[PDB]
Design a protein around this ligand. Structure first.
Ligand SMILES: Nc1nc2c(ncn2[C@@H]2O[C@H](COP(=O)(O)OP(=O)(O)OP(=O)(O)O)[C@@H](O)[C@H]2O)c(=O)[nH]1
Ligand SMILES: [Mg+2]
Lengths: 431, 120, 130, 196, 139
RNA sequence: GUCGAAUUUGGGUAUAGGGGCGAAAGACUAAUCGAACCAUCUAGUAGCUGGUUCCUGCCGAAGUUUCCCUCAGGAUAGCAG
RNA sequence: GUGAUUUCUGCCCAGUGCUCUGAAUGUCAAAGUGAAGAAAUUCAACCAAGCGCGGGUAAACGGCGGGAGUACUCUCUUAAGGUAGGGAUUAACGAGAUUCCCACUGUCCCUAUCUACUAUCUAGCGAAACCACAGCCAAGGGAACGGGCUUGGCAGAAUCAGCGGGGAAAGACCCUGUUGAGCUUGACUCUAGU
RNA sequence: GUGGCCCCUUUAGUCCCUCGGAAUUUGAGGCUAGAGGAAAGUUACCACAGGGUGGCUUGUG
RNA sequence: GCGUUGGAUUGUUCACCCACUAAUAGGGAACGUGAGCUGGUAGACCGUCGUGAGACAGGUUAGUUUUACCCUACUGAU
């Protein structure tokens, strides 16, 4: 057992954690080996080329260093002397080579730094300066295109480790000195217009969901992301402000100008035609759900919808369900009359099908629930024609419009539809 | 207490034999090896016939429909010929292999006695 | 009358296995299941690929390859198993007849109804549904 | 449980393919076999290069012997610096046999071409001072053989670069048993000589 | 009795390996089964495995593999629980076929050939222990 | 089959029943072992089987009719005294 | 746990277990603390281990590929590579399973003969199984099946030695109890110990 | 013309009853009226108790 | 009416092979549950499955019923 003890680390560390005044020489016997090992790492199937590897076999030097790193990181607190430069050695092993290290060794160092920060050996203010620069470097597109670069796994590890760090730091009280510092790097990433704000948006969404970053300073970051030029950043911002919306709307600085800038930049202004329909629809949803909720006025929305309000168009049931969400009690009903007369011309016309007509009437009555004086009695009557329609979609739809105007403006309806209380209320109030 | 099916279902989120092992789906599969069996009473007579042995003569009808008598499987000549050529190219090469092979149509790939009668 | 019981084990005590006694259509890529996992047994001799389909008009019959089974009137499980009992409705290829629709598209599949009980006769005789 | 049916009209979505439209689209992947290297090629030692990592020990010994024999025909080529790169880390190997075979190989390549030793001297001394600090004593003992055989050929740029690492590693492994001490002392003589 | 087992194995198999002796592959070929597999069952794969390649020189093996790779993939092999050849290549090929048959939930591989060719020994070589009985006598 | 030894054996001694011992067969533990033997609680008990002791006279049946978580032991309609 | 020697011994800690002198936060029993009330009581806070969380381990049970780009789809590495074309020609022992050859014979064609003790007869001695009653056949009815019933064939005392066709005349397998016990497991309720 | 064609949870009681030595105030129990709706496998190592032809066919799809 | 064989083959035989022969015909009385004599549970191993105890898609091996002296029939004997 004695001759094998230097080979068995798991027993050595349990012995050292008991009586660490002893086992000094046993620790130096391994620190010297670790030093000599790091001083090294610092510096195909074709008939011709050398044969390749499977991706899971490693070197005996690396297999030893991966063990020694854990041993030293777990007994550094017992030996503060002879280990003061150890975490700095790890840090400059990582952020000066990035490439001459195998993935297992990188992962091991990344976990040992995290536990060395859980213990108060290392501070977050100097672990952040190790973790963040590796994200940008392994999202390079030139580092991630080796043979067996583990770039995606490393980018996931560093991200979840940052999350654990900030979750650690914001437990008792919110470390404002840290949050205010690592929001500045998100701001200074979103400036770089290529794609690097991905690691700001993807992180701020996580921290909002974990409730760690409920602050006005953070919603500005996602506003700037939504106002960005890159599609996968704009979408991150839009899906953040969606998730029916979340409480972040109640920490905005100017929602009306936000919606105006969005509608001007992305959809209408240059007509760059970058977003696909699946993303344009998600932008429409955000705009309409902000507008209806906060009583906004843009008036370009209501002509932008009209191109897409045709039953021969791709997935219109989402578009028309957002059309209603941008209606108010406080907008000129003529610009909605044109919309209702487009829908009526193209969905409840002659020959149209049952689903088409029912969709039209259902998306008109939920408009009129917000903007009641946006369609007049003459077309209201044309649509309550379809009460007894034998199809069971159009009947259920027309009954909703009738019950909507039975409580709001029952004089537009005819005597046949005023249902026993609207008529009685009108008979007393007409004299 | 932690090792109870109650506590397990609580911490995670019915059929006889659902444990830490062997979820719903697995129990039904493993019961196949046993209970293809025939139920009886104590005196001896069939209560419940074995599986796939119900022993009832059903009403075997087939209703009229305009969808019978119609062409069920159609193909244009140009697509047909291109499909012939590509697969004649593909299926001569043994190193090649078609992926689905079940959704694919593979089915698309004188005499003197009239004068003399054995007797003349 | 359709499923025969099959018993497994040294002391045969487990049955759980069912052999279909009648003629069957399995498909083109059948590839039997493993023995520990197969319950339904469709033996190779009771496996048809071609039928004897008659056009009522033309007084003509043809030995056509079967493409599918759409409707066996008994318990639509039997449709998925592909049991060719009497009255069963099948899709058969008709490219040998040179049928073409208005537009010039060649027809290569049509419905047919089997007229015989092929458990008694090795023949699967059928009538086209025009 | 009908024989014919429609999903629905499904406003907003693509319409459908009717009922009988045949779909003539497919994909055909092509199988790929290994080569198995059954026919002799001039690039054959490049394949035996990587057998220095083989988990077996006789494999590595016989590979080192083959590379030893094939020295004069490969001494000036594109294979020698990768040979030394891949074989130098066997200084920290678990076997006296493999370490001895590497000693023989470095003697042969030293008799032939010493500029390559002069070029690869740095990783050489790194692995030597790693073996000097190795927790395993079989490896800690056979360090000075590599050191002396290295000094035999290159000799003075090794001390021009690294002197103190060598001296303190030797004084460490000496403890400051029968023949390893003699080898350490001969290495000390040669080291102090090249320090003169 | 034997040919019933043959056809059972084929009908249960998704892949069929055809084991040949490198001493006399054309003797040990069995072309009629390949013709049956062509006409009856094109959805099966039908590859060749030269075995007992340790008994002949390397150039004979390379020649036969070249001659037979024109038609069928044709791996070369040597069967032993200790000292093997072609194991990883065959593993790679089988997992290729597995990746192709991603919907079946399992993929069966039959071993066809003359007697005394090394089918049981190839299986014992893949599993790396004695799974199937082996003997120098044929049956 | 083995026959100079992991040998064969006498007497003394130790291990006791949900226990012992086991070069492991669920083997052995006084002809009893996948839980010894003796007595008592004990006329233990289901379920089902078997049997149930003299004469004569008068009357004299019954088999989905309705239900308790499907068998099921049942509870009831009707029949007769 | 594996099971002489020799040879071989590649990779995975996703899962399940085991382990870590592993921070904080979360879950969080009793006692103890605070608030309300006239009080019984009610509420809140604090709240050990364990769990959760994240590190190690495969001559632990499992298990069998890796990475990257936009679950899918394209790409390329696959180091379970034979170190050599000498890579496998591989003991002794065994009441172990199996095939073939020589020798040898009544195993066989194809049976025959001889010896001893019985059987056999005699003196003496003297049981057991089983037993509704009994004991000749055929056809018919019939639970596929008569010794008894119907119709026919027949039928003569009392008996000895043999035989094994039938009767003697005394089995497995299948199913069921809401059974008895043995065993197993994150099945239920408990429990020694810790 | 008195509409239309087919059983375990919770709340409330003016001056409801009781808390049995008397009372008051909290609680509790009633009677009213409301609103809601304990438990898996295996046994071939086993044991017990019970049970178990319609003259049918033939050579010709 | 009288005859309708001898053998090879158990990696098997619901059979086939070559010879002799005048010929090498088919069947029943058992197999319309189960009945001379002979081949084809307890222990152990490999495979599939199962968390496991164990089970089986399998495969291999070893593995104790024991009349007639009774009536009848039959064969011979008084
Ligand atoms: N030299 C050499 N011998 C082999 C090899 N493979 C098999 N053998 C030998 O060949 C003998 C008989 O071949 P088997 O392994 O039984 O092959 P098989 O006849 O298909 O096996 P079964 O399916 O059991 O009949 C074995 O006893 C082996 O000793 C090989 O690759 N090299
Ligand atoms: Mg064989």
């Amino acid at each position: 057992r004695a001759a094998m003890l230097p080979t068995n680390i798991i027993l050595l560390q349990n012995l050292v954690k008991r009586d660490p005044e002893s086992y000094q020489e046993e620790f130096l016997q391994q620190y010297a080996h670790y030093e000599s090992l790091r001083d090294i790492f610092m510096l195909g199937n074709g008939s011709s080329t050398m044969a390749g590897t499977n991706g899971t076999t490693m070197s005996t030097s690396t297999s030893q260093l991966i063990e020694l790193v854990g041993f030293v990181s777990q007994v550094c607190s017992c030996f503060p002397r002879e280990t003061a430069n150890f975490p700095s050695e790890l840090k400059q092993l990582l952020l000066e080579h990035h490439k001459s290290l195998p993935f297992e060794l990188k992962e091991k160092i990344l976990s040992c730094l995290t536990m060395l920060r859980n213990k108060d050996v290392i501070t977050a203010e100097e672990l952040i300066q190790s973790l963040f620069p590796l994200l940008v470097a392994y999202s390079s597109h030139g580092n991630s295109l080796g043979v067996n670069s583990h770039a995606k796994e490393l980018r996931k590890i560093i991200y979840t480790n940052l999350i654990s760090l900030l979750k650690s730091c914001n437990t008792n009280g919110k470390n404002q000195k840290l949050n205010k510092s690592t929001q500045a790097v998100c701001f200074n990433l979103l400036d770089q217009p290529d794609s690097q704000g991905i690691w700001a948006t993807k992180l701020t969404r996580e921290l909002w969901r974990r409730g760690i970053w409920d602050d006005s300073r953070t919603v500005e970051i996602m506003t700037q992301a939504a106002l960005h030029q890159d599609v996968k950043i704009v979408m991150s911002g839009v899906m953040f402000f969606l998730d029916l919306n979340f409480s972040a709307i109640h920490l905005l600085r100017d929602p009306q100008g936000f919606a105006e800038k969005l509608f001007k930049e992305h959809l209408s202004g240059k007509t760059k035609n970058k977003f696909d329909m699946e993303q344009k629809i998600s932008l429409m949803q955000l705009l309409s759900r902000l507008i209806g909720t906060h009583k906004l006025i843009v008036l370009g929305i209501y002509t932008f919808f009209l191109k897409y309000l045709t039953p021969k168009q791709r997935d219109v049931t989402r578009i028309m369900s957002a059309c209603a969400q941008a209606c108010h009690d406080l907008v000129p009903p003529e610009v909605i009359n044109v919309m209702v007369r487009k829908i009526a011309d193209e969905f409840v016309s002659d020959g149209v099908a049952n689903e088409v007509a029912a969709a039209g009437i259902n998306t008109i009555r939920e408009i009129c629930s917000r903007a009641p004086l946006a369609i007049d009695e003459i077309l209201l009557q044309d649509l309550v024609e379809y009460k007894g329609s034998k199809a069971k979609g159009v009947n259920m739809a027309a009954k909703s419009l009738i019950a909507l105007y039975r409580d709001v403006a029952p004089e537009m309806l005819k005597k046949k539809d005023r249902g026993k209380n609207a008529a009685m209320e009108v008979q007393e109030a007409k004299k | 207490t932690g090792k109870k099916e109650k506590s397990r279902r609580i911490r995670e989120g019915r059929v006889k034999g659902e444990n830490f092992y062997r979820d719903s789906k697995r129990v039904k599969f493993l019961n196949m090896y046993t209970s293809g069996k025939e139920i009886r009473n104590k005196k001896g007579n069939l209560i419940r016939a074995a599986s796939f042995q119900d022993s009832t003569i059903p009403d075997a009808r087939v209703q009229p429909d305009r969808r019978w008598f119609g062409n069920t499987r159609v193909i244009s000549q140009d697509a047909l010929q291109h499909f012939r050529s590509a697969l004649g190219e593909t299926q001569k090469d043994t190193y090649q292999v078609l992926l689905r092979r079940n959704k694919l149509p593979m089915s698309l790939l004188a005499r003197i006695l009239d004068t003399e009668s054995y007797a003349d | 009358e359709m499923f025969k019981v099959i018993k497994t084990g040294k002391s045969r005590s487990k049955s759980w296995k069912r052999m279909i006694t009648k003629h069957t259509f399995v498909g083109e890529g059948f590839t039997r299941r493993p023995v520990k996992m197969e319950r339904i047994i469709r033996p190779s001799a009771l496996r048809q690929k071609k039928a004897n389909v008659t056009h009522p008009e033309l007084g003509v019959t043809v030995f056509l390859p079967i493409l599918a089974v759409k409707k066996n009137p008994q318990s639509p499980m039997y449709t998925q198993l592909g049991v060719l009992t009497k009255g069963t409705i099948i899709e058969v290829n008709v490219s040998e007849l040179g049928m073409v629709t208005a537009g010039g598209k060649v027809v290569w599949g049509k419905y047919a109804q089997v007229t015989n009980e092929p458990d008694r006769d090795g023949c699967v005789n059928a009538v086209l549904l025009v | 449980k009908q024989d014919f049916l429609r999903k629905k009209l499904k406003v907003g979505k693509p319409k459908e393919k009717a009922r009988n439209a045949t779909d003539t689209s497919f994909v055909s992947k092509t199988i790929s076999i290994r080569n198995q290297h059954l026919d002799q090629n001039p690039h054959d030692l490049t394949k035996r290069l990587t057998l220095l990592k083989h988990h077996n020990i006789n494999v590595r010994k016989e590979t080192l012997t083959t590379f030893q024999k094939s020295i004069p025909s490969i001494i000036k080529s594109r294979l020698m610096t990768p040979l030394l790169t891949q074989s130098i880390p066997l200084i920290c190997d678990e076997s006296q046999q493999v370490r001895q075979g590497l000693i023989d190989l470095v003697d042969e390549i030293g008799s032939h071409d010493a500029e390559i030793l002069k070029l690869h001297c740095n990783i050489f001394v790194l692995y030597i001072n790693m073996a000097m600090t190795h927790i395993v004593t079989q490896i800690q003992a056979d360090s000075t053989k590599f050191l002396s055989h290295l000094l035999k050929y290159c000799g003075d740029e090794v001390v021009r670069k690294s002197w103190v690492k060598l001296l303190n590693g030797v004084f460490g492994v000496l403890g400051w048993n029968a023949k390893y001490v003699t080898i350490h002392l001969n290495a000390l003589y040669t080291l102090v000589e090249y320090g003169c | 009795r034997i040919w019933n087992e043959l056809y059972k194995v084929i009908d249960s198999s998704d892949v069929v390996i055809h084991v040949l002796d490198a001493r006399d592959p054309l003797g040990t070929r069995c072309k009629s089964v390949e013709e049956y597999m062509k006409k009856e069952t094109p959805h099966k794969h039908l590859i060749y495995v030269l075995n007992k390649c340790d008994l002949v020189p390397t150039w004979v093996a390379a020649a036969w593999v070249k001659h037979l790779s024109k038609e069928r993939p044709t791996l070369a092999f040597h069967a032993s629980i200790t000292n093997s050849f072609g194991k990883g290549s065959l593993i790679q090929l089988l997992r290729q076929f597995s990746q192709l048959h991603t919907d079946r939930k399992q993929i069966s591989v039959g071993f066809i050939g003359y007697p005394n060719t090394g089918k049981s020994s190839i299986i014992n070589t893949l599993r790396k222990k004695k799974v199937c009985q082996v003997a120098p006598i044929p049956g």
